[PDB]
């Protein structure tokens, strides 16, 4: 995913 | 003469669930597709003897 994508930020919030 | 409580304070449980799935696929269709069933030779004969 692109660095600035909003979908990338959602991925980073999973599997905490 | 003692009486019970209306309810008992239970313990609270937090549940964290993660589901991950990845799918990949390829599809190729290349070449030349010829006919495999073709008509063959023919022969006929006809005569009137009388």
Resolution (A): 2.4
Torsion of CA B32, B33, B34, B38, to 10 degrees: 180
Distance between alpha carbon A6 and the CA centroid of its chain, in Å? 6
| DSSP per position, B4-49 | --SS-----------------------S------------------
d(CA A9, CA A3): 9
A-chain CB neighbours of B20 within 8 Å are 15
A-chain CB neighbours of B18 within 8 Å are 14-15
* A14–B18 CB contact, under 8 Å: yes
CB contact, 8 Å: A12 with chain B? no
Q: How was this structure determined?
A: cryo-EM
């Amino acid at each position: 995913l692109p660095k600035g994508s909003t979908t990338r930020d959602a991925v980073d919030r999973t599997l905490g | 003469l003692a009486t019970p409580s209306p309810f008992d304070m239970e313990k609270m449980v937090w549940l964290d669930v993660n589901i991950l799935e990845i799918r990949k696929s390829v599809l190729e269709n290349f070449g030349v597709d010829w006919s495999k069933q073709i008509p063959g030779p023919f022969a006929a004969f006809g005569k009137d003897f009388v």
